[PDB]
Amino acid sequence: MGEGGFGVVYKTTVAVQEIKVMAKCQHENLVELLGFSSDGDDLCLVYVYMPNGSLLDRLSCLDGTPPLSWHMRCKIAQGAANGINFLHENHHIHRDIKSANILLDEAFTAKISDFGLARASETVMTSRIVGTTAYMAPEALRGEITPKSDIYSFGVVLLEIITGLPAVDEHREPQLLLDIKEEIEDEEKTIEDYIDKKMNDADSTSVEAMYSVASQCLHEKKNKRPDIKKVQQLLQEMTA
Template sequence: MRFTYTEVQEMTNSFERVLGEGGFGVVYHGCINGTQQVAVKLLSQSSSQGYKHFKAEVELLMRVHHINLVSLVGYCDEGDHLALIYEYMSNGDLKQHISGNRGGFVLSWETRLKIAANVALGLEYLHIGCKPAMVHRDIKCTNILLDEHYQAKLADFGLSRSFSTGSETYVSTVVAGTPGYLDPE
């Protein structure tokens, strides 16, 4: 769904509650029609990622759907105002739980294993289930979100790319991702 900037302001109650912040911009809590909770990622004017990554994420999430990938509910593309509207993940990101920033609650080993398996299933879908196959290029704890049942979903697809189909001769060698989370290759 496409939303106007005025609708984005209304759903976030004028950007009242911040959920997090990343390279793209600030993520706000929102509500559509007073019932459906959402996360609204608003592009910062100082963002180094900009329109290119916004467009890449919208295009990818419009064509891929999997239980372990965060769902795109809508977007706003109105002048300088760019926003991505996602399903709301009530238990935040994995980093909050690993670092102890969620009230000291420690994840059980069973829950940790479930999260790892969910992430692996999401990656398997991107690598094998998608045609053409996709590579995320920014897997890290802050991009693994948890719902109310601690089901993990991958988020932040702005750096994602399609795998080579074999017939292509060009291979990108540009480094992309977050320092500290890049494969050594």
């Protein structure tokens, strides 16, 4: 699989701190660790394979897969938030919530992955700043460690789900997707202008309702963002 750049993902079908976060186990919206290989210089982690790859790859229609319907995109969002909720109910911070780390199973269920950067809660500061710039909250880029950062990153994900655009693309204006919130809030464009054109079933009312969550998630003052249990409620209310 097309990895980011830390811990490669190679293809009974399988995908070859992360183990301590598995210890808890048993959740439908989190990827499942079957085993691992420590005996050697290299370290492997074996997971139950996700035949429909990442949400990033499905949003880009990588390898000619058909575009995801609005109906499946609402199910994916609802599911990814249940995954993040379980992490937060268990006082864990993902620290790298993004479309490339939301995987899809035989039935297109959203499964959160890559808990190498994960930290237990169970606000802290760190000199080793980690995450994907284009998804990170302001405070996370400044060293803070808080569940609140995962909510901001999940906000960028909702914009990728709605718009089908990648969080960052240099050959674009704005190059950072999260800037579109300001274009819309400052009434130049509207969310309708940004809806992914590769969908036949996305109605304006539910799109707007998903964007409302995305806008709350993307709040800059970290204490003004909703908690994941509130994000789940707003996403379940979206369908309904």
